[PDB]
Amino acid sequence: SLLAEFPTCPRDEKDRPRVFTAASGAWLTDESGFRWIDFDNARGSILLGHGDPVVAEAVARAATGADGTATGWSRRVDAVLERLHALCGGEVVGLFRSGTAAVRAAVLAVREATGRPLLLSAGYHGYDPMWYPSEAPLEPNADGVVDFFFDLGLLRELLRAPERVAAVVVSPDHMHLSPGWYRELRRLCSAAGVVLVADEVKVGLRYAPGLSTAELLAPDVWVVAKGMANGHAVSAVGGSRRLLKPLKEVSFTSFFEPTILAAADAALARVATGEPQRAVREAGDRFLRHARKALDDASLPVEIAGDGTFFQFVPATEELEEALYGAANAEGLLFYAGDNQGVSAAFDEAVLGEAERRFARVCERLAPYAGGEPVGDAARYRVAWNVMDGLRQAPRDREETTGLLARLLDDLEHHHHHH
Amino acid sequence: SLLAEFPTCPRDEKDRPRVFTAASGAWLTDESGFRWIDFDNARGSILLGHGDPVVAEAVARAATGADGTATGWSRRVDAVLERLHALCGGEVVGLFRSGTAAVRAAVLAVREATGRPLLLSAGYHGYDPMWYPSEAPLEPNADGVVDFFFDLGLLRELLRAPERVAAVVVSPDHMHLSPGWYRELRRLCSAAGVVLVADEVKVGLRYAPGLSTAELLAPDVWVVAKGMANGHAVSAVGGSRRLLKPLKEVSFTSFFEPTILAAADAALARVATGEPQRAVREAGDRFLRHARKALDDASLPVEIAGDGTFFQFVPATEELEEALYGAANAEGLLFYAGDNQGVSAAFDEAVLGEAERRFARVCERLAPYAGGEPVGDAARYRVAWNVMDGLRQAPRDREETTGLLARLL
Ligand SMILES: Cc1ncc(COP(=O)(O)O)c(CN)c1O
Ligand SMILES: Cc1ncc(COP(=O)(O)O)c(CN)c1O
Numbered sequence: 001s002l003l004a005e006f007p008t009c010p011r012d013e014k015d016r017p018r019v020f021t022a023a024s025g026a027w028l029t030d031e032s033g034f035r036w037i038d039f040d041n042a043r044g045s046i047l048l049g050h051g052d053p054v055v056a057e058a059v060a061r062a063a064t065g066a067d068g069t070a071t072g073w074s075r076r077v078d079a080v081l082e083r084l085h086a087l088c089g090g091e092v093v094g095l096f097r098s099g100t101a102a103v104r105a106a107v108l109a110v111r112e113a114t115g116r117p118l119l120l121s122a123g124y125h126g127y128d129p130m131w132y133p134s135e136a137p138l139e140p141n142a143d144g145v146v147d148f149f150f151d152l153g154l155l156r157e158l159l160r161a162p163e164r165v166a167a168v169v170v171s172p173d174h175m176h177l178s179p180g181w182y183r184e185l186r187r188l189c190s191a192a193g194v195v196l197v198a199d200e201v202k203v204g205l206r207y208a209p210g211l212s213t214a215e216l217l218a219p220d221v222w223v224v225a226k227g228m229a230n231g232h233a234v235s236a237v238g239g240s241r242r243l244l245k246p247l248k249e250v251s252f253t254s255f256f257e258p259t260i261l262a263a264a265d266a267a268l269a270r271v272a273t274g275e276p277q278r279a280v281r282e283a284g285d286r287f288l289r290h291a292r293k294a295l296d297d298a299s300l301p302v303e304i305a306g307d308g309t310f311f312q313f314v315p316a317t318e319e320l321e322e323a324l325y326g327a328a329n330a331e332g333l334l335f336y337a338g339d340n341q342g343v344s345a346a347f348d349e350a351v352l353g354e355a356e357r358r359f360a361r362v363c364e365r366l367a368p369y370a371g372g373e374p375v376g377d378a379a380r381y382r383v384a385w386n387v388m389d390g391l392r393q394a395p396r397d398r399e400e401t402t403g404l405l406a407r408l409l410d411d412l413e414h415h416h417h418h419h
Numbered sequence: 420s421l422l423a424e425f426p427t428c429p430r431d432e433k434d435r436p437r438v439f440t441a442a443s444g445a446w447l448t449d450e451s452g453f454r455w456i457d458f459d460n461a462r463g464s465i466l467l468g469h470g471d472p473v474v475a476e477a478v479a480r481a482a483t484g485a486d487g488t489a490t491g492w493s494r495r496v497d498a499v500l501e502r503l504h505a506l507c508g509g510e511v512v513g514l515f516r517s518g519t520a521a522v523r524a525a526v527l528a529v530r531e532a533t534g535r536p537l538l539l540s541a542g543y544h545g546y547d548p549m550w551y552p553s554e555a556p557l558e559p560n561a562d563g564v565v566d567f568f569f570d571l572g573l574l575r576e577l578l579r580a581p582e583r584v585a586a587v588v589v590s591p592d593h594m595h596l597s598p599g600w601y602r603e604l605r606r607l608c609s610a611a612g613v614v615l616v617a618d619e620v621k622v623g624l625r626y627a628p629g630l631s632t633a634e635l636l637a638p639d640v641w642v643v644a645k646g647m648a649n650g651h652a653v654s655a656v657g658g659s660r661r662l663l664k665p666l667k668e669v670s671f672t673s674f675f676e677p678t679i680l681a682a683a684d685a686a687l688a689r690v691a692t693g694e695p696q697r698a699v700r701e702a703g704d705r706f707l708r709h710a711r712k713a714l715d716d717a718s719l720p721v722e723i724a725g726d727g728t729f730f731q732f733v734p735a736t737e738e739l740e741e742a743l744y745g746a747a748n749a750e751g752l753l754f755y756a757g758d759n760q761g762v763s764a765a766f767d768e769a770v771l772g773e774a775e776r777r778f779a780r781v782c783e784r785l786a787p788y789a790g791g792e793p794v795g796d797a798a799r800y801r802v803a804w805n806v807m808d809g810l811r812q813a814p815r816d817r818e819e820t821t822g823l824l825a826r827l828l
Contacts, residue, residue, distance in 0.1 A: 002500045004511035004666040007674045009491035023488035031494075042489035043672050051484025059678060060479035065470025070461035070650040071753070072428035073436035075450075081421045092697035094423035097516035097652055098671045108548050127669045131526050201672075226672060231489040233516055233652045233673045237423065246425040250546045252517045253462050253620075253645060254652040255426045259478060259678060334490070384741070419670055 005278035008418050009074035010040060013326075023050035025346035037355045040336040041344050044202055044310065045226035047102055047276050048267060049346025055230050055266045062318065070254065074257045076261040083268040084148060088222050090238035094247045097254065099225040100126025102235035106223050107169055109237075109246040110195050111144075118168035120158050122150040123171025124389045124419055127197055137405055150177065151389035152399055162192035162302035167221070169197040172213055175306030175340065176384045176392035195243065201225040201235065206342075207281075207309050208275045227271060232263040277309070278343040283347035284308025290356045298363040299370040306386070310340040314383045316375045320366075323381070327365040331358040338386045339418060381408065386418070429459060429753055442469035444765035447753065456774050459755040460763050463646035463729065465666040467686060468765025474685045489673065495680040502687040506629045507641050509658040513666045516673065518620035518644040519545025521654035525642050528587055528613050528665040530563075535585040539577050541569040542590025543808045544618055556824055568809035569596065570820050571603055581611040586640075588616040591632055593642035594725030594759065595803045595811035599752040609637075613699050614662060620644040620654065625761075626728055628693045631772045635645055640681035646690060647766050651682035695764040696728070702766035703727020709775045717782040724803070729759040734795045739785075740802075750777040757805045800827060 010018040019031040026049060028036040038050070048055060060068060068074030084093045103125045111117065118140060118286035124133050134141035138154065141147075148154040150170075159165065168189050172182070189196045203212040205227030213219060221239035228234060237244065254260075270276050284307035295302050301316035302324065313335070313363035315321040325337045333355060335341055347355075376395065382390035385408045396404070429437040438450040440543050445456045445468060457469070467474065470641030480486060490577035515521035522544040530538065537559060544817050553560035557573065560566075568575045569589075578584065585720045587608050591601070608615045615632060617623075622631040624646025632638060640662055644654035656663065673679075689695055704727035720735035721743065732754070734740040744756045754760055766774075796813070803811035804827050810820070 002504050002510075002512050003496075004513040004660075004663045005674075006667045008670045009675065017492035019492050019494060020487045020490065021493070022486075023484035023490070028488055038488070038490055040490050041674065046489060049490050050490075053483075056482035056484075058480075059482040061474075063470065063475040063478040063482075065475075065712075066490065067441075069439045069442035069447055069448060069457070069469050071439060071440050071457055071459050071469075072443070074440065075438060077422075085421050090656060091421075092423035093421050098520065098673065099515065101520060101673055104547075127671060128523075129531075129668075231673060231676055233679060234546060234675055241423075245425045249428045249548075250424040252519055253464050253548060254517065254650060256428065256461065257650055257652055260652060263501045318748050331789040 006416065008043065018313065024050070024353040025049040026344060034185060034332060036332045036334040037351060038334050039341040040342060041342050042231050043226070044206065044340065044342030045229055046344050047206060047280065047342045048230045048270060052230055058262040058266040060261045062258040067258045067262060068256070070257045072256055074258060076254065076258065076265050077256070080264045080268065083265070083272060084228070084238060087268070087272060088224065089210075089214070090222065091241045092244050093236055093238040095242065095255065096235045096237065097233055097252065099223070099235050100128050102223045102225060102237050103169070103199050103201065104128050104130060105250060106197060106221050106237045106244075107167060109244050110197060110221060111166040112246040113243045114166045114195060116164055117144045118165045119145045119162065119170045120155065120165055121145050121147050121170070122390050123173070123199060125169065125171065125388065126190060126215065127419070137409070144203055149392070149405060150388065150393070151391055152181070152188060152372060153398060153401060155185070155188055159192040159194065161196050162234050165192070167193045168199045169196040169199055171199040171201070171388070172203050173388040174203065174207065175213060175310060175312055176388055178393055179216055180248055181393050182213060186217050195220045197221045197223070199223050202272060205271050206277060208277060226358055228268055229239050229260065229264040230267040232260050234260050234264050279345040280343055280347070281308040283352060284311060284343045286352055287343065287355060293361050294363045296361055298366065300363060300366055301372045301374045302412055303375045306340065308343070310342050312340050312383065312387055314380055316372055316379055320369050320372065323366060323369065324362070327362040330363050330365065333358050333362065337418065338383070340387050345347045361369050382411070385412070427462065436666040444468040444470070445763060445770040445805055451623050453677045453751060453753045455494045455753040456751050456770060456777065458760040458762060459753050460717065460761050462645065462648045462755060463625070463759065464650045464763035466646055466699065467649045467689065467765050468763045471649055473680050477681040477685040478678050481677040484677075486677050486681060487675070489676045491675050493675065493677060493680065495677065495684055496675065498678055499680055499687065500728070501768060502684070502691060503643070503647070503655050505658060506687070506691060507643065508633070509641065510660040511663050512655055512657040513656045513663065513669060514670065514674070515656065516652055517545065518642070519547050521642045521644060521656050522588070522618050522620065523547050523549060523778055524666060524669060525616055525640050525663070526586060527615060528663050529640060530585040531665040533585045533614060536563045537582055538564045538585055539574065539587045540564050540566050541705050541809050542592070542618060543590065544590065545772040556828070568824060569807065569812070570692045570810055570815070570819055571600070571607065572815070572820060574604070574607060578607060578611040581613050584611070586615045586616045588618060589618070590618040590807070592732055592807045593622065593626065593631060594729060595807055598635060601632060606635050614639045616640040616642070618642050624690050624697060627696060627698070628691050647687060648679065648683040649686040651679050653679050654682050671820045679762065698764040699762055699766070700727040702771060703730060703762045705771055706762065706774055708764070710778055713779050713782045717785065719782060720788070720791045720793045722794045725759065727762070729761050731759050731806055732801065733794055733799055735798055737790060739788050739791065742785060742788065743781070746781040749784065750780050752777050752781065757802065759806050
């Protein structure tokens with residue numbers, strides 16, 4: 001009861017946080033001694049594995065003072081900046097202490113540099129009150145943000161009068177939006193003459209050694225975080241000197257803290273090769289071939305969206321979704337409940353074999369659900385909203401859009417989110 | 420050229436950042452190999468010393484996974500929250516990733532909980548644009564903040580309409596404001612029925628094992644940061660459940676990152692004894708006895724405000740200020756230029772002897788300024804503004820305040 005916040009974390013059947021006492025690679029141990037295989041991985045910020053030895057040794061050494069001081073500049077600051085700039089492009093780069101801080105700073109900078117008041121947004125951008133929803137949909141909230149819920153129909157309407165729009169700010173999802181969705185967003189922004197900000201806090205550096213939307217969107221400004229430091233407390237923005245000039249006003253006390261620079265430098269050295277990203281895609285795709293087969297062989301109506309990099313279970317009903325995570329928890333498979341699963345590079349052959357055996361047993365426990373009505377679009381929309389906070393791509397008419405927004409938002413009114 | 424930000428850090432004569440390759444206790448080594456005694460200490464966030472061995476082992480252990488995972492809860496979370504609650508009081512505690520994030524979340528929470536639009540501010544609260552200057556003084560900025568510059572006269576004017584005030588939010592300075600200033604602030608807040616938020620990011624946990632203003636202000640909500648983790652990336656807010664209920668909407672990805680929790684737990688354990696704060700006060704005070712005598716024997720018009728916990732040089736002119744830091748730089752004494760000096764618990768007898776010897780040499784280098792015109796009030800206001808972003812305490816009538824604000828802005 002001391003904690004004033006409500007952090008997203010694995011929680012047990014009583015909604016209490018699970019207490020983990022140790023972690024190594026893919027494996028967590030809880031306070032009771034039970035071993036879990038981690039598909040959550042701090043919401044996909046642990047690309048390399050828990051307690052990765054090279055990152056951990058870099059951090060341990062930096063904690064001694066041997067790599068510099070929080071007092072000021074070290075050559076590792078250059079190393080991190082240079083690596084980011086090489087991977088993600090743009091002219092300048094800034095460093096921040098959370099994704100939330102970075103996206104807020106990025107969009108305010110664009111608002112300042114363009115002199116325009118409105119932000120058109122799709123997806124989650126962090127906990128800051130600036131993103132809190134408006135009273136009426138398609139109306140600006142109190143901080144000048146209009147949420148379009150990934151609907152490019154709605155976006156086209158908003159961009160008819162584009163002169164007040166400072167930027168379109170989008171958190172990509174590559175499970176629920178196709179490449180062509182991104183092409184259309186880009187050309188809607190081009191036609192309107194508006195700035196495009198890619199919030200790649202989650203997806204940046206994970207699909208490839210750069211932005212996931214580098215070619216698809218060629219954003220004017222980008223943000224990354226989860227992929228840059230194997231979980232350590234850093235994020236980054238980059239893009240044009242002109243658009244980001246207002247960032248010259250940013251400074252914070254811990255900027256030079258050397259453990260965080262150490263972890264970023266070490267993780268980004270791995271990220272730059274593209275190897276962990278490939279390892280993760282391959283491991284997760286292996287797990288998926290198996291899980292899809294096991295669900296099909298057991299007649300369970302659960303689809304899987306996405307791929308090895310990030311995948312999501314899409315069960316036909318909420319009661320089956322509940323029973324799925326209950327069963328997984330019983331078997332020590334730690335999924336990020338309802339959201340996307342993001343394996344790490346520590347998912348080696350032995351880990352995969354065990355996760356496959358555990359998943360087979362999950363499917364055995366789910367026997368009562370065999371033969372149920374298959375997955376319908378209503379379920380696909382509800383489950384996708386739980387990862388992207390807006391609408392998956394599918395054909396619909398404007399009235400279907402309105403109805404889905406109304407239903408999806410109403411049903412989340414009195415539930416905690418899991419950002 | 421790549422860096423979009425302009426970070427505060429030690430910079431050379433061309434304003435280029437100084438590059439430090441190693442650090443241990445009180446000592447830094449720069450890229451040229453020159454060894455410096457650090458009075459800056461990450462702007463006063465290094466209470467214990469660089470590479471403190473106990474913190475270092477706690478961090479190393481946590482880096483391996485042996486204390487848990489960034490995936491979720493660990494008993495170290497409970498440890499940190501319990502220690503903060505014991506030290507600072509209140510009902511609830513939240514953790515954040517910078518002082519800036521913590522103060523913003525705290526004040527927005529209070530605005531939501533009270534349903535009142537205005538924040539009356541004195542001092543620096545972080546880099547966020549919510550704190551940017553209004554287009555005209557005593558007027559709200561675009562985010563509903565009215566800066567009163569630590570003038571209690573101006574605060575009184577602003578509190579005549581207290582229905583619109585969510586909170587008064589103050590960053591203490593104990594060099595330039597007396598205990599009486601705090602008592603009067605407390606009195607005025609209570610009379611108006613307005614919430615008082617102590618932004619103790621800098622001063623929290625450093626003067627004592629608790630809030631610097633626990634007794635003077637008894638704030639409804641507090642924020643600390645620089646004192647809690649020997650420089651690691653964490654800050655904390657606490658106070659009443661009611662006022663901070665809106666923090667229930669806060670979550671962030673790296674919340675459970677184990678190295679930061681480890682550093683906080685270890686630093687807070689030491690903070691709780693009161694030993695490092697005493698060691699810092701004593702070491703600083705000794706250094707100050709020496710520095711004051713040296714400046715006086717050299718006939719140098721430089722006063723020193725504050726005490727061993729945080730002190731500031733107040734030179735008579737900007738020319739002499741610049742010459743003072745130039746000379747300190749040549750002798751390997753790294754001061755936080757123009758701001759407050761914050762020694763660490765690593766300032767032992769050997770560091771102190773060497774610092775004393777170096778500062779004596781500084782005073783020799785400054786012999787050209789001997790006998791210069793003494794420090795005046797305009798200098799005192801200017802230098803104090805550099806540390807507190809408002810007005811040092813001194814008797815003023817409204818027109819003197821108005822004119823100082825115009826001159827200093
Ligand atoms: C797309 C996006 N943007 C911003 C954020 C916020 O990042 P943080 O949790 O580090 O504040 C997140 C993390 N939920 C994210 O997924
Ligand atoms: C009183 C006060 N409040 C807030 C902040 C911002 O803290 P941070 O630099 O960690 O963002 C500072 C930084 N010195 C401060 O001194």
